[PDB]
Amino acid sequence: VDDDDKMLAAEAANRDHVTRCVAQTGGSPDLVAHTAALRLYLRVPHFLTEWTTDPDRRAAVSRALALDIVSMKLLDDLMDDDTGLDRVELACVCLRLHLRALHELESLARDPKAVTDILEQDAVHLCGGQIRTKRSRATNLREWRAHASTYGSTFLGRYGALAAACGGEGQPADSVREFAEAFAMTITMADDLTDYDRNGERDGNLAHLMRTGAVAGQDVVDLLEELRGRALAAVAAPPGAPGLVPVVHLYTDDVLVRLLPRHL
Amino acid sequence: DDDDKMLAAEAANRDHVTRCVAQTGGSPDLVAHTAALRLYLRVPHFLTEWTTDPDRRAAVSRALALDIVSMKLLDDLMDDDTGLDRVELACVCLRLHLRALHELESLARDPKAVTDILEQDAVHLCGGQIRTKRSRATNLREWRAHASTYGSTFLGRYGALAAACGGEGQPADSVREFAEAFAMTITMADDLTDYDRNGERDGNLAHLMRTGAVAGQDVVDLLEELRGRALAAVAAPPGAPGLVPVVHLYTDDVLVRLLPRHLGEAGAGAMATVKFKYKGEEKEVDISKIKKVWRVGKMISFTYDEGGGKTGRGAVSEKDAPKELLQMLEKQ
Protein backbone atom coordinates (compact mmCIF):
# COMPACT_ATOMS: atom_id res chain seq x y z
CA VAL A 1 0.00 0.00 0.00
CA ASP A 2 1.88 3.10 -1.27
CA ASP A 3 1.25 6.88 -1.27
CA ASP A 4 -0.57 6.78 -4.57
CA ASP A 5 -2.86 4.20 -3.01
CA LYS A 6 -3.56 6.53 -0.12
CA MET A 7 -4.16 9.53 -2.33
CA LEU A 8 -6.52 7.51 -4.52
CA ALA A 9 -8.54 6.26 -1.60
CA ALA A 10 -8.69 9.75 -0.08
CA GLU A 11 -10.00 11.25 -3.30
CA ALA A 12 -12.63 8.55 -3.71
CA ALA A 13 -13.73 8.99 -0.09
CA ASN A 14 -13.93 12.78 -0.48
CA ARG A 15 -15.89 12.48 -3.71
CA ASP A 16 -18.45 10.10 -2.18
CA HIS A 17 -18.85 12.31 0.91
CA VAL A 18 -19.51 15.26 -1.36
CA THR A 19 -21.91 13.54 -3.78
CA ARG A 20 -23.92 11.93 -0.97
CA CYS A 21 -24.29 15.35 0.60
CA VAL A 22 -25.30 17.00 -2.68
CA ALA A 23 -27.86 14.34 -3.47
CA GLN A 24 -29.44 14.28 0.03
CA THR A 25 -30.05 18.00 -0.08
CA GLY A 26 -31.88 17.89 -3.36
CA GLY A 27 -29.09 18.25 -5.91
CA SER A 28 -30.09 16.97 -9.38
CA PRO A 29 -28.13 14.21 -11.22
CA ASP A 30 -26.44 16.88 -13.39
CA LEU A 31 -25.31 18.88 -10.35
CA VAL A 32 -24.17 15.66 -8.55
CA ALA A 33 -22.12 14.73 -11.61
CA HIS A 34 -20.60 18.19 -11.96
CA THR A 35 -19.49 17.86 -8.39
CA ALA A 36 -17.97 14.38 -8.91
CA ALA A 37 -15.94 15.84 -11.82
CA LEU A 38 -14.00 18.33 -9.62
CA ARG A 39 -11.08 15.88 -9.42
CA LEU A 40 -8.14 18.00 -8.36
CA TYR A 41 -10.39 19.96 -5.90
CA LEU A 42 -11.34 16.63 -4.28
CA ARG A 43 -7.70 15.48 -4.22
CA VAL A 44 -6.09 18.63 -2.88
CA PRO A 45 -7.42 18.15 0.68
CA HIS A 46 -5.30 14.95 0.85
CA PHE A 47 -2.13 16.95 0.25
CA LEU A 48 -3.09 19.60 2.79
CA THR A 49 -3.57 16.96 5.46
CA GLU A 50 -0.23 15.21 4.81
CA TRP A 51 1.11 16.35 8.24
CA THR A 52 -1.79 14.65 10.13
CA THR A 53 -0.50 11.37 11.61
CA ASP A 54 -3.76 9.88 12.97
CA PRO A 55 -5.38 8.19 9.90
CA ASP A 56 -8.98 8.55 11.15
CA ARG A 57 -8.49 12.26 11.94
CA ARG A 58 -6.75 12.75 8.58
CA ALA A 59 -9.63 11.25 6.57
CA ALA A 60 -12.17 13.31 8.63
CA VAL A 61 -10.35 16.65 8.00
CA SER A 62 -9.76 15.77 4.38
CA ARG A 63 -13.40 15.19 3.58
CA ALA A 64 -14.57 18.30 5.55
CA LEU A 65 -12.09 20.49 3.57
CA ALA A 66 -13.41 18.86 0.37
CA LEU A 67 -17.01 19.91 1.27
CA ASP A 68 -16.02 23.54 1.65
CA ILE A 69 -13.73 23.61 -1.37
CA VAL A 70 -16.53 22.14 -3.53
CA SER A 71 -18.89 24.64 -1.98
CA MET A 72 -16.71 27.64 -2.99
CA LYS A 73 -16.28 26.14 -6.39
CA LEU A 74 -20.08 26.01 -6.83
CA LEU A 75 -20.32 29.62 -5.65
CA ASP A 76 -17.82 30.43 -8.40
CA ASP A 77 -20.01 28.60 -10.96
CA LEU A 78 -22.89 30.68 -9.72
CA MET A 79 -21.04 33.91 -10.30
CA ASP A 80 -19.95 33.06 -13.89
CA ASP A 81 -23.46 31.67 -14.60
CA ASP A 82 -22.09 29.54 -17.48
CA THR A 83 -22.45 25.85 -16.61
CA GLY A 84 -26.02 25.35 -17.73
CA LEU A 85 -26.85 24.20 -14.16
CA ASP A 86 -29.92 25.35 -12.29
CA ARG A 87 -28.94 28.48 -10.27
CA VAL A 88 -31.35 27.59 -7.49
CA GLU A 89 -29.76 24.18 -6.98
CA LEU A 90 -26.28 25.66 -7.25
CA ALA A 91 -26.91 28.25 -4.57
CA CYS A 92 -28.72 25.88 -2.24
CA VAL A 93 -26.22 23.03 -2.49
CA CYS A 94 -23.39 25.58 -2.18
CA LEU A 95 -24.84 26.77 1.17
CA ARG A 96 -25.64 23.29 2.45
CA LEU A 97 -22.06 21.92 1.77
CA HIS A 98 -20.49 24.97 3.37
CA LEU A 99 -22.51 24.71 6.59
CA ARG A 100 -21.72 21.00 6.85
CA ALA A 101 -18.02 21.75 6.34
CA LEU A 102 -18.17 24.34 9.13
CA HIS A 103 -19.85 21.90 11.41
CA GLU A 104 -17.34 19.07 10.62
CA LEU A 105 -14.31 21.29 10.85
CA GLU A 106 -15.38 22.82 14.15
CA SER A 107 -15.93 19.41 15.65
CA LEU A 108 -12.30 18.51 14.72
CA ALA A 109 -10.54 21.72 15.70
CA ARG A 110 -8.66 21.96 18.98
CA ASP A 111 -10.42 25.33 19.44
CA PRO A 112 -13.69 25.66 17.48
CA LYS A 113 -13.19 29.48 17.31
CA ALA A 114 -10.03 29.01 15.16
CA VAL A 115 -12.15 27.94 12.19
CA THR A 116 -14.01 31.28 12.03
CA ASP A 117 -10.82 33.13 12.98
CA ILE A 118 -9.09 31.71 9.88
CA LEU A 119 -12.09 32.26 7.61
CA GLU A 120 -12.56 35.91 8.72
CA GLN A 121 -8.86 36.98 8.85
CA ASP A 122 -8.20 37.56 5.21
CA ALA A 123 -11.78 37.35 3.97
CA VAL A 124 -11.56 40.94 2.73
CA HIS A 125 -8.30 40.13 0.87
CA LEU A 126 -9.79 37.04 -0.74
CA CYS A 127 -13.24 38.47 -1.65
CA GLY A 128 -12.06 41.96 -2.56
CA GLY A 129 -9.35 40.16 -4.52
CA GLN A 130 -11.76 38.07 -6.59
CA ILE A 131 -13.80 41.21 -7.39
CA ARG A 132 -10.69 43.07 -8.73
CA THR A 133 -9.52 40.04 -10.75
CA LYS A 134 -12.74 40.18 -12.69
CA ARG A 135 -12.84 43.99 -12.83
CA SER A 136 -9.37 44.75 -14.24
CA ARG A 137 -8.07 41.86 -16.35
CA ALA A 138 -4.36 41.07 -16.18
CA THR A 139 -2.05 42.22 -19.03
CA ASN A 140 1.37 40.89 -18.02
CA LEU A 141 2.87 38.35 -15.64
CA ARG A 142 3.19 40.83 -12.71
CA GLU A 143 -0.54 41.52 -12.85
CA TRP A 144 -1.49 37.87 -13.42
CA ARG A 145 0.46 36.71 -10.36
CA ALA A 146 -1.00 39.47 -8.23
CA HIS A 147 -4.58 38.39 -8.98
CA ALA A 148 -3.74 34.65 -8.70
CA SER A 149 -2.24 35.28 -5.29
CA THR A 150 -5.77 35.94 -4.11
CA TYR A 151 -8.27 33.52 -5.74
CA GLY A 152 -5.54 30.87 -5.95
CA SER A 153 -2.99 31.33 -3.12
CA THR A 154 -4.96 32.98 -0.35
CA PHE A 155 -7.83 30.72 -1.25
CA LEU A 156 -5.87 27.45 -0.71
CA GLY A 157 -3.78 29.02 2.08
CA ARG A 158 -6.90 29.29 4.23
CA TYR A 159 -7.64 25.53 3.79
CA GLY A 160 -3.99 24.93 4.62
CA ALA A 161 -4.42 26.89 7.81
CA LEU A 162 -7.65 24.96 8.54
CA ALA A 163 -5.94 21.57 8.01
CA ALA A 164 -3.37 22.49 10.65
CA ALA A 165 -5.98 23.79 13.10
CA CYS A 166 -8.09 20.65 12.72
CA GLY A 167 -5.21 18.22 12.36
CA GLY A 168 -4.07 17.69 15.97
CA GLU A 169 -0.47 18.29 17.09
CA GLY A 170 2.77 17.98 15.23
CA GLN A 171 1.63 20.61 12.79
CA PRO A 172 3.81 23.51 11.57
CA ALA A 173 0.86 25.84 10.78
CA ASP A 174 2.87 28.50 8.85
CA SER A 175 4.51 25.82 6.72
CA VAL A 176 1.29 24.03 5.82
CA ARG A 177 -0.02 27.43 4.70
CA GLU A 178 3.19 28.29 2.82
CA PHE A 179 2.93 24.94 1.02
CA ALA A 180 -0.74 25.52 0.12
CA GLU A 181 -0.09 29.01 -1.27
CA ALA A 182 2.83 28.01 -3.48
CA PHE A 183 1.17 24.80 -4.60
CA ALA A 184 -2.09 26.68 -5.32
CA MET A 185 -0.38 29.02 -7.67
CA THR A 186 1.24 26.12 -9.68
CA ILE A 187 -2.16 24.57 -10.12
CA THR A 188 -3.85 27.90 -10.84
CA MET A 189 -1.38 28.33 -13.72
CA ALA A 190 -2.04 24.75 -14.83
CA ASP A 191 -5.71 25.59 -14.82
CA ASP A 192 -5.29 28.77 -16.89
CA LEU A 193 -3.26 26.93 -19.50
CA THR A 194 -5.84 24.16 -19.70
CA ASP A 195 -8.99 26.31 -19.58
CA TYR A 196 -7.74 28.45 -22.46
CA ASP A 197 -8.81 25.76 -24.97
CA ARG A 198 -11.35 23.95 -22.79
CA ASN A 199 -13.23 27.11 -21.80
CA GLY A 200 -12.40 29.59 -24.55
CA GLU A 201 -10.89 31.90 -21.89
CA ARG A 202 -9.02 35.02 -23.09
CA ASP A 203 -9.01 38.26 -21.05
CA GLY A 204 -6.65 37.84 -18.10
CA ASN A 205 -5.89 34.24 -19.15
CA LEU A 206 -2.21 33.42 -18.82
CA ALA A 207 -2.19 31.19 -21.95
CA HIS A 208 -3.71 34.04 -23.90
CA LEU A 209 -1.00 36.45 -22.72
CA MET A 210 1.71 33.95 -23.59
CA ARG A 211 0.35 33.50 -27.11
CA THR A 212 -0.18 37.23 -27.75
CA GLY A 213 3.33 37.99 -26.50
CA ALA A 214 2.39 40.00 -23.41
CA VAL A 215 4.15 37.28 -21.34
CA ALA A 216 7.49 35.54 -21.92
CA GLY A 217 7.78 31.79 -21.74
CA GLN A 218 11.01 31.99 -19.69
CA ASP A 219 9.34 34.15 -17.09
CA VAL A 220 6.55 31.54 -16.71
CA VAL A 221 9.21 28.84 -16.33
CA ASP A 222 10.95 31.06 -13.73
CA LEU A 223 7.78 31.54 -11.73
CA LEU A 224 7.12 27.79 -11.82
CA GLU A 225 10.61 27.12 -10.48
CA GLU A 226 10.24 29.75 -7.76
CA LEU A 227 6.97 28.14 -6.66
CA ARG A 228 8.51 24.65 -6.79
CA GLY A 229 11.32 25.90 -4.52
CA ARG A 230 8.93 27.61 -2.06
CA ALA A 231 6.77 24.47 -1.83
CA LEU A 232 9.74 22.14 -1.28
CA ALA A 233 11.01 24.48 1.40
CA ALA A 234 7.69 24.49 3.21
CA VAL A 235 7.43 20.69 3.38
CA ALA A 236 10.96 20.40 4.78
CA ALA A 237 10.33 22.54 7.88
CA PRO A 238 9.89 20.33 11.02
CA PRO A 239 7.99 18.01 11.61
CA GLY A 240 8.23 17.72 7.81
CA ALA A 241 5.96 16.21 5.10
CA PRO A 242 8.35 14.29 2.80
CA GLY A 243 5.46 12.59 1.08
CA LEU A 244 4.67 15.95 -0.60
CA VAL A 245 8.02 16.25 -2.41
CA PRO A 246 7.08 13.99 -5.37
CA VAL A 247 3.67 15.71 -5.56
CA VAL A 248 5.30 19.16 -5.92
CA HIS A 249 7.57 17.81 -8.66
CA LEU A 250 4.64 16.07 -10.41
CA TYR A 251 2.43 19.14 -10.82
CA THR A 252 5.28 21.51 -11.66
CA ASP A 253 6.82 19.25 -14.26
CA ASP A 254 3.43 18.63 -15.80
CA VAL A 255 3.05 22.37 -16.42
CA LEU A 256 6.62 22.59 -17.79
CA VAL A 257 6.44 19.52 -20.03
CA ARG A 258 2.84 19.20 -21.16
CA LEU A 259 1.20 22.56 -20.79
CA LEU A 260 3.77 25.24 -21.68
CA PRO A 261 4.68 23.91 -25.13
CA ARG A 262 1.05 24.33 -26.06
CA HIS A 263 1.43 28.07 -25.90
CA LEU A 264 4.96 28.58 -27.27
CA ASP B 1 -39.20 55.32 22.86
CA ASP B 2 -39.24 51.63 21.82
CA ASP B 3 -40.02 52.94 18.38
CA ASP B 4 -36.95 55.16 18.59
CA LYS B 5 -34.79 52.26 19.81
CA MET B 6 -36.07 50.21 16.88
CA LEU B 7 -35.30 52.95 14.36
CA ALA B 8 -31.82 53.45 15.73
CA ALA B 9 -31.04 49.72 15.75
CA GLU B 10 -32.06 49.52 12.12
CA ALA B 11 -29.79 52.49 11.32
CA ALA B 12 -26.85 50.99 13.23
CA ASN B 13 -27.32 47.64 11.48
CA ARG B 14 -27.53 49.53 8.15
CA ASP B 15 -24.29 51.32 8.97
CA HIS B 16 -22.45 48.09 9.91
CA VAL B 17 -23.60 46.25 6.74
CA THR B 18 -22.90 48.95 4.12
CA ARG B 19 -19.38 49.64 5.56
CA CYS B 20 -18.61 45.96 5.37
CA VAL B 21 -19.94 45.79 1.76
CA ALA B 22 -17.97 48.91 0.79
CA GLN B 23 -14.69 47.70 2.33
CA THR B 24 -14.94 44.37 0.41
CA GLY B 25 -15.15 46.25 -2.85
CA GLY B 26 -18.87 46.30 -3.39
CA SER B 27 -19.91 49.06 -5.80
CA PRO B 28 -22.25 52.02 -4.88
CA ASP B 29 -25.22 50.13 -6.44
CA LEU B 30 -24.61 47.06 -4.25
CA VAL B 31 -24.13 49.25 -1.20
CA ALA B 32 -27.46 50.97 -2.06
CA HIS B 33 -29.15 47.63 -2.59
CA THR B 34 -28.21 46.41 0.88
CA ALA B 35 -29.06 49.71 2.56
CA ALA B 36 -32.53 49.34 1.04
CA LEU B 37 -33.16 46.01 2.91
CA ARG B 38 -35.06 47.89 5.63
CA LEU B 39 -37.10 45.06 7.14
CA TYR B 40 -34.17 42.64 6.97
CA LEU B 41 -32.02 45.19 8.83
CA ARG B 42 -34.71 45.79 11.43
CA VAL B 43 -35.67 42.20 12.06
CA PRO B 44 -32.51 41.50 14.15
CA HIS B 45 -33.83 44.09 16.58
CA PHE B 46 -37.02 41.99 17.11
CA LEU B 47 -35.03 38.72 17.55
CA THR B 48 -32.78 40.26 20.18
CA GLU B 49 -35.64 41.81 22.22
CA TRP B 50 -34.95 39.42 25.12
CA THR B 51 -31.31 40.57 25.49
CA THR B 52 -30.88 42.42 28.76
CA ASP B 53 -27.42 43.87 28.28
CA PRO B 54 -27.57 46.67 25.65
CA ASP B 55 -23.99 46.34 24.38
CA ARG B 56 -24.47 42.62 23.74
CA ARG B 57 -27.88 43.36 22.18
CA ALA B 58 -26.43 45.79 19.67
CA ALA B 59 -23.52 43.49 18.78
CA VAL B 60 -25.74 40.43 18.26
CA SER B 61 -28.23 42.53 16.32
CA ARG B 62 -25.70 43.74 13.81
CA ALA B 63 -24.08 40.29 13.40
CA LEU B 64 -27.48 38.83 12.58
CA ALA B 65 -28.03 41.68 10.12
CA LEU B 66 -24.76 40.70 8.37
CA ASP B 67 -25.83 37.14 7.73
CA ILE B 68 -29.45 37.84 6.89
CA VAL B 69 -28.27 40.31 4.28
CA SER B 70 -25.66 37.87 2.97
CA MET B 71 -28.39 35.20 2.47
CA LYS B 72 -30.55 37.78 0.71
CA LEU B 73 -27.61 38.47 -1.71
CA LEU B 74 -27.25 34.70 -2.31
CA ASP B 75 -30.97 34.69 -3.18
CA ASP B 76 -30.47 37.67 -5.60
CA LEU B 77 -27.76 35.51 -7.15
CA MET B 78 -29.96 32.49 -7.67
CA ASP B 79 -32.55 34.63 -9.46
CA ASP B 80 -29.99 36.88 -11.24
CA ASP B 81 -32.51 39.63 -12.07
CA THR B 82 -31.29 42.57 -9.97
CA GLY B 83 -28.97 44.13 -12.55
CA LEU B 84 -26.22 43.84 -9.94
CA ASP B 85 -22.80 42.49 -10.92
CA ARG B 86 -22.74 38.72 -10.10
CA VAL B 87 -19.10 38.74 -8.95
CA GLU B 88 -19.73 41.51 -6.45
CA LEU B 89 -22.87 39.68 -5.27
CA ALA B 90 -21.09 36.38 -4.69
CA CYS B 91 -18.02 37.85 -3.05
CA VAL B 92 -19.86 40.32 -0.83
CA CYS B 93 -22.32 37.57 0.04
CA LEU B 94 -19.36 35.37 1.22
CA ARG B 95 -17.49 38.18 3.01
CA LEU B 96 -20.56 39.28 4.99
CA HIS B 97 -21.45 35.77 5.99
CA LEU B 98 -17.91 35.05 7.23
CA ARG B 99 -17.91 38.25 9.29
CA ALA B 100 -21.28 37.26 10.77
CA LEU B 101 -19.91 33.81 11.82
CA HIS B 102 -16.91 35.40 13.53
CA GLU B 103 -19.08 37.98 15.38
CA LEU B 104 -21.78 35.50 16.51
CA GLU B 105 -19.21 32.93 17.61
CA SER B 106 -17.58 35.60 19.72
CA LEU B 107 -20.81 36.07 21.63
CA ALA B 108 -22.13 32.54 21.72
CA ARG B 109 -22.87 30.71 24.96
CA ASP B 110 -20.83 27.76 23.65
CA PRO B 111 -18.18 27.36 20.90
CA LYS B 112 -20.21 24.97 18.79
CA ALA B 113 -23.66 26.46 19.24
CA VAL B 114 -23.53 28.66 16.05
CA THR B 115 -22.46 25.89 13.67
CA ASP B 116 -24.79 23.42 15.40
CA ILE B 117 -27.75 25.71 14.74
CA LEU B 118 -26.75 26.39 11.09
CA GLU B 119 -26.23 22.67 10.39
CA GLN B 120 -29.25 21.08 12.30
CA ASP B 121 -31.79 21.98 9.69
CA ALA B 122 -29.63 23.06 6.74
CA VAL B 123 -31.02 20.21 4.60
CA HIS B 124 -34.64 21.11 5.45
CA LEU B 125 -33.83 24.71 4.54
CA CYS B 126 -31.73 24.11 1.38
CA GLY B 127 -33.69 21.21 -0.10
CA GLY B 128 -36.83 23.10 0.90
CA GLN B 129 -35.77 26.13 -1.16
CA ILE B 130 -34.92 23.83 -4.10
CA ARG B 131 -38.36 22.24 -3.99
CA THR B 132 -40.15 25.56 -3.63
CA LYS B 133 -38.81 26.47 -7.09
CA ARG B 134 -38.95 22.99 -8.62
CA SER B 135 -42.68 22.33 -7.83
CA ARG B 136 -44.64 25.61 -7.67
CA ALA B 137 -47.38 25.66 -5.02
CA THR B 138 -50.94 25.38 -6.41
CA ASN B 139 -53.09 25.67 -3.26
CA LEU B 140 -52.81 27.05 0.29
CA ARG B 141 -51.50 23.80 1.83
CA GLU B 142 -48.59 23.61 -0.64
CA TRP B 143 -47.82 27.33 -0.42
CA ARG B 144 -47.63 27.01 3.37
CA ALA B 145 -45.43 23.91 3.32
CA HIS B 146 -42.86 25.65 1.06
CA ALA B 147 -43.05 28.97 3.03
CA SER B 148 -42.33 27.08 6.22
CA THR B 149 -38.86 26.36 4.84
CA TYR B 150 -37.48 29.48 3.07
CA GLY B 151 -39.59 31.63 5.42
CA SER B 152 -40.13 30.11 8.88
CA THR B 153 -37.10 27.83 9.20
CA PHE B 154 -34.97 30.54 7.61
CA LEU B 155 -35.77 33.12 10.27
CA GLY B 156 -36.13 30.50 13.05
CA ARG B 157 -32.39 29.75 12.73
CA TYR B 158 -31.64 33.47 13.37
CA GLY B 159 -34.10 33.36 16.29
CA ALA B 160 -32.12 30.39 17.67
CA LEU B 161 -28.85 32.26 17.12
CA ALA B 162 -30.18 35.42 18.86
CA ALA B 163 -30.96 33.23 21.93
CA ALA B 164 -27.61 31.42 21.71
CA CYS B 165 -25.68 34.68 21.56
CA GLY B 166 -27.82 36.84 23.82
CA GLY B 167 -26.49 35.97 27.28
CA GLU B 168 -28.81 34.87 30.11
CA GLY B 169 -32.60 34.99 30.34
CA GLN B 170 -33.31 33.87 26.78
CA PRO B 171 -36.23 31.44 26.41
CA ALA B 172 -34.66 29.73 23.35
CA ASP B 173 -37.74 27.85 22.11
CA SER B 174 -39.83 30.95 22.42
CA VAL B 175 -37.54 33.32 20.56
CA ARG B 176 -37.41 30.76 17.80
CA GLU B 177 -41.19 30.19 17.71
CA PHE B 178 -41.77 33.99 17.50
CA ALA B 179 -39.32 34.02 14.63
CA GLU B 180 -40.97 31.24 12.67
CA ALA B 181 -44.46 32.62 13.05
CA PHE B 182 -43.52 36.24 12.33
CA ALA B 183 -41.46 35.14 9.28
CA MET B 184 -44.53 33.61 7.73
CA THR B 185 -46.70 36.71 8.24
CA ILE B 186 -43.89 38.69 6.55
CA THR B 187 -43.49 36.07 3.78
CA MET B 188 -47.19 36.37 2.97
CA ALA B 189 -46.94 40.16 2.91
CA ASP B 190 -44.02 39.89 0.47
CA ASP B 191 -45.97 37.61 -1.86
CA LEU B 192 -48.95 39.93 -1.88
CA THR B 193 -46.66 42.91 -2.53
CA ASP B 194 -44.32 41.35 -5.09
CA TYR B 195 -47.21 40.14 -7.21
CA ASP B 196 -47.23 43.69 -8.60
CA ARG B 197 -43.87 45.09 -7.51
CA ASN B 198 -42.11 42.15 -9.34
CA GLY B 199 -44.69 40.65 -11.70
CA GLU B 200 -44.45 37.35 -9.71
CA ARG B 201 -47.01 34.68 -10.63
CA ASP B 202 -46.07 30.98 -10.42
CA GLY B 203 -46.37 29.84 -6.80
CA ASN B 204 -47.27 33.41 -5.71
CA LEU B 205 -49.96 33.61 -3.03
CA ALA B 206 -51.71 36.66 -4.59
CA HIS B 207 -51.77 34.92 -7.92
CA LEU B 208 -53.30 31.82 -6.30
CA MET B 209 -55.98 34.05 -4.70
CA ARG B 210 -56.87 35.94 -7.88
CA THR B 211 -56.95 32.64 -9.74
CA GLY B 212 -59.36 31.14 -7.25
CA ALA B 213 -56.99 28.32 -6.10
CA VAL B 214 -56.84 29.81 -2.57
CA ALA B 215 -59.78 31.32 -0.66
CA GLY B 216 -59.53 34.63 1.14
CA GLN B 217 -60.99 33.30 4.38
CA ASP B 218 -58.30 30.61 4.56
CA VAL B 219 -55.64 33.32 4.21
CA VAL B 220 -57.30 35.31 6.96
CA ASP B 221 -57.32 32.20 9.17
CA LEU B 222 -53.64 31.47 8.55
CA LEU B 223 -52.79 35.12 9.40
CA GLU B 224 -54.76 34.81 12.64
CA GLU B 225 -53.07 31.54 13.53
CA LEU B 226 -49.62 33.17 12.98
CA ARG B 227 -50.59 36.24 15.01
CA GLY B 228 -51.66 34.02 17.93
CA ARG B 229 -48.50 31.90 17.62
CA ALA B 230 -46.27 34.98 17.72
CA LEU B 231 -48.22 36.54 20.62
CA ALA B 232 -47.93 33.31 22.65
CA ALA B 233 -44.16 33.06 22.08
CA VAL B 234 -43.69 36.62 23.17
CA ALA B 235 -45.79 36.05 26.37
CA ALA B 236 -43.61 33.15 27.63
CA PRO B 237 -41.56 34.18 30.74
CA PRO B 238 -39.48 36.41 31.04
CA GLY B 239 -41.46 37.92 28.15
CA ALA B 240 -40.83 40.41 25.31
CA PRO B 241 -43.99 42.64 25.60
CA GLY B 242 -42.43 45.22 23.34
CA LEU B 243 -43.03 42.78 20.46
CA VAL B 244 -46.82 42.73 20.97
CA PRO B 245 -47.53 46.01 18.99
CA VAL B 246 -45.06 44.75 16.39
CA VAL B 247 -46.94 41.48 15.77
CA HIS B 248 -50.28 43.34 15.47
CA LEU B 249 -48.82 45.97 13.19
CA TYR B 250 -47.66 43.49 10.53
CA THR B 251 -50.60 41.13 10.70
CA ASP B 252 -53.15 43.98 10.52
CA ASP B 253 -51.25 45.58 7.67
CA VAL B 254 -51.63 42.40 5.62
CA LEU B 255 -55.34 42.13 6.56
CA VAL B 256 -56.20 45.74 5.96
CA ARG B 257 -53.91 46.89 3.19
CA LEU B 258 -52.73 43.95 1.18
CA LEU B 259 -55.51 41.34 1.21
CA PRO B 260 -58.25 43.49 -0.33
CA ARG B 261 -56.09 44.10 -3.38
CA HIS B 262 -56.49 40.45 -4.30
CA LEU B 263 -60.10 39.71 -3.23
CA GLY B 264 -62.53 42.29 -4.63
CA GLU B 265 -66.12 43.11 -3.42
CA ALA B 266 -66.01 42.08 0.29
CA GLY B 267 -63.68 39.02 0.24
CA ALA B 268 -64.39 37.77 3.78
CA GLY B 269 -66.60 35.43 1.82
CA ALA B 270 -69.11 35.37 4.60
CA MET B 271 -71.75 37.83 3.33
CA ALA B 272 -73.22 39.07 6.64
CA THR B 273 -76.97 38.95 7.38
CA VAL B 274 -79.75 40.04 9.78
CA LYS B 275 -82.30 37.54 11.04
CA PHE B 276 -85.66 38.77 12.33
CA LYS B 277 -89.35 37.90 12.51
CA TYR B 278 -91.75 40.03 10.46
CA LYS B 279 -95.48 39.48 10.18
CA GLY B 280 -95.17 36.11 11.92
CA GLU B 281 -92.50 34.95 9.47
CA GLU B 282 -88.80 34.07 9.92
CA LYS B 283 -86.57 36.27 7.74
CA GLU B 284 -82.92 36.84 6.95
CA VAL B 285 -81.51 39.51 4.68
CA ASP B 286 -78.02 40.26 3.31
CA ILE B 287 -76.54 43.52 4.60
CA SER B 288 -76.17 44.24 0.87
CA LYS B 289 -79.94 44.56 0.32
CA ILE B 290 -80.25 46.98 3.27
CA LYS B 291 -81.32 50.52 2.38
CA LYS B 292 -82.06 52.69 5.46
CA VAL B 293 -81.19 52.02 9.13
CA TRP B 294 -81.82 53.96 12.39
CA ARG B 295 -81.90 53.52 16.14
CA VAL B 296 -84.84 53.70 18.60
CA GLY B 297 -83.61 52.98 22.10
CA LYS B 298 -81.90 49.58 21.93
CA MET B 299 -83.89 48.59 18.80
CA ILE B 300 -82.49 48.87 15.31
CA SER B 301 -85.10 49.63 12.66
CA PHE B 302 -84.52 49.38 8.89
CA THR B 303 -85.76 49.01 5.34
CA TYR B 304 -84.38 46.81 2.54
CA ASP B 305 -84.89 45.65 -1.03
CA GLU B 306 -87.25 42.65 -1.31
CA GLY B 307 -87.85 42.05 -5.06
CA GLY B 308 -87.83 44.86 -7.57
CA GLY B 309 -89.20 48.20 -6.48
CA LYS B 310 -90.47 46.07 -3.56
CA THR B 311 -89.45 47.35 -0.10
CA GLY B 312 -89.09 45.34 3.10
CA ARG B 313 -89.20 46.40 6.75
CA GLY B 314 -87.85 45.17 10.02
CA ALA B 315 -86.43 45.91 13.44
CA VAL B 316 -84.18 43.82 15.70
CA SER B 317 -82.65 44.29 19.15
CA GLU B 318 -79.09 45.67 18.81
CA LYS B 319 -78.06 42.48 20.63
CA ASP B 320 -79.04 40.64 17.43
CA ALA B 321 -77.66 43.16 14.95
CA PRO B 322 -74.49 42.13 13.03
CA LYS B 323 -71.48 44.47 13.17
CA GLU B 324 -72.14 45.36 9.52
CA LEU B 325 -75.65 46.70 10.19
CA LEU B 326 -74.57 48.65 13.22
CA GLN B 327 -71.88 50.25 11.05
CA MET B 328 -74.48 51.48 8.59
CA LEU B 329 -76.13 53.25 11.53
CA GLU B 330 -73.21 55.60 12.17
CA LYS B 331 -72.69 55.84 8.39
CA GLN B 332 -76.30 57.15 8.36
Give an account of the 3D structure.
Chain A: InterPro entries: Isoprenoid_synthase_dom_sf (IPR008949). Chain A: This is MoeN5. The structure is a homodimer. The first copy, chain A, is mainly α and 264 residues long. Chain A has a single domain, classed as Farnesyl Diphosphate Synthase (Orthogonal Bundle), CATH 1.10.600. Helix content of chain A is 78%, strand content 0%. Chain A is built from twelve helices and no strands. The first copy, chain A, has helices at residues 3-24, 29-36, 39-48, 55-80, 87-108, 113-121, 123-135, 141-166, 173-199, 206-212, 217-236, 244-259. In chain A, helix 4 packs antiparallel against helix 8 and helix 8 (141-166) crosses helix 9. Chain A is globular, with a radius of gyration of 18 Å. Chain A starts with a helix and ends in a 5-residue tail after the last helix. Chain A binds chain B through residues 24-27, 72, 75-76, 78-81, 87-96, 99-100, 102-103, 106-107, 111-113, 116-117, 119-120, 123-124, 127-128, 130-132, 134-135, and chain B through 23-26, 71, 74-75, 77-80, 86-95, 98-99, 101-102, 105-106, 111-112, 115-116, 118-119, 122-123, 126-127, 129-131, 133-134.
